[PDB]
Amino acid sequence: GSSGSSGPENDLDESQVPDQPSSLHVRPQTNCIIMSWTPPLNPNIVVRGYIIGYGVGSPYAETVRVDSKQRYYSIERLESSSHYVISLKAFNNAGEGVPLYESATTRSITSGPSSG
């Protein structure tokens, strides 16, 4: 946020859902995948958290609702050499807002980054 926003909804807009994170970085690891997003360009909006929807081929394989404080989530217990679609979206008393999609293909344990 800004100016250390500590406290309940004072001069924000909860009636409306939180917009997507200005940006969502995701790094597909061997058996894990770390992701770091940011708050809505509009600090005047209420944010109860974010819905982390990741999954192999489809971001609807595993969902994880975190707090509005979590700026990043490390997805572990994943496979290697597979596409992992990550979809992060902000949620609040109003519900869910413009969901943000992403892509992250895990790594490969066995040596060999590419054929060529």
Domain ranges of the chain: 10-106
- Residues 6 or more apart whose Cβ sits within 8 Å of residue 43: 1, 2, 5, 12
- What is the three-class DSSP state of 10? coil
CB 96 within 8 A of CB 90: yes
Q: Identify the CA nearest to 51 among candidates 108, 3, 107, 100.
A: 100
In terms of CATH, what superfamily is 10-106? Immunoglobulins (2.60.40.10)
> In whole angstroms, what is the distance from residue 64 CA to residue 107 CA?
22
Residue type, 61: A
Structure tokens at 87: 């979809």
